[PDB]
Design a protein around this ligand. Structure first.
Ligand SMILES: N=C(N)c1ccc2nc(C(=O)c3nc4ccc(C(=N)N)cc4[nH]3)[nH]c2c1
Ligand SMILES: [Ca+2]
Length: 223
């Protein structure tokens, strides 16, 4: 997260780290047995780490659980990153409490101008590299489709929205992919892609979760 702040240990209790020997993507716990993340985060051998703040220190609130199965969206296109979403089932149910909580799926889509919280352990520098060990947070508005599509011509589909600041300075970044965009208590976005991080006129692009609720609910119930 570039230009964000330290969340505070376990203030984002639905945030997940996906680990395959090291943190490589975030995710969101949507109930005790299921995580949603980005399909471009797919790997074989995922361990889901819940209750994390510093990902390099065991501070006592963590639950480390292996993934039993991963389901990438049936129409995921890795070239356009259209339908960038995947579900990950846990081998055993998470114990929910104040530090490990699930996030709600949306009943409808959020409008332009709604303020959202975006969180992750990704790169904190735009020109350069610096990786945080504690969770970073950023409040950002959903931008209008016109300014999202003018920023990326011919690349935004109906399944994507932009969030952030066109002056730049504040954005999601690599290492944040798969992570949550929560607006009004609902999971509305997934960190998907962007051009670099925090550049002017290059906002982040997020998977629009309100278009996938039927697919998520049908898939978790049959698996
Ligand atoms: N090797 C992998 N499995 C992998 C996983 C995640 C990646 N994510 C990227 C990656 O390219 C990437 N993730 C981004 C997220 C946000 C922004 C942004 N500016 N909002 C830019 C990003 N660029 N490459 C990736 C590669
Ligand atoms: Ca830890």
């Amino acid at each position: 997260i570039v230009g964000g702040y330290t969340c505070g240990a376990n203030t984002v209790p639905y945030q997940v780290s996906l680990n395959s020997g090291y943190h490589f993507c975030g995710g969101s716990l949507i109930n005790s047995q299921w995580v949603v993340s980005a399909a471009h985060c797919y790997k074989s051998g995922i361990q889901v780490r819940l209750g994390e703040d510093n990902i390099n220190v065991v501070e006592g609130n963590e639950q480390f659980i292996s993934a039993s199965k991963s389901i990438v969206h049936p129409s995921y296109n890795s070239n356009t990153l259209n339908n960038d979403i995947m579900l990950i089932k846990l081998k055993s149910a998470a114990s929910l409490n104040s530090r490990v909580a699930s996030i709600s799926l949306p009943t409808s889509c959020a409008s332009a101008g709604t303020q959202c919280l975006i969180s992750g352990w990704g790169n904190t520098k735009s020109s350069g590299t610096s990786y945080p060990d504690v969770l970073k947070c950023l409040k950002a508005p959903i931008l209008s489709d016109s300014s999202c599509k003018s920023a990326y011509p011919g690349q935004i589909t109906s399944n994507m929205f932009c969030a952030g600041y066109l002056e730049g300075g504040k954005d999601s970044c690599q290492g944040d992919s798969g992570g949550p965009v929560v607006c009004s208590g609902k999971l509305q976005g997934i960190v998907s892609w962007g051009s670099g991080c925090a550049q002017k006129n290059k906002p982040g692009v997020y998977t629009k979760v309100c278009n996938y609720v039927s697919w998520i609910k049908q898939t978790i119930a049959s698996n």
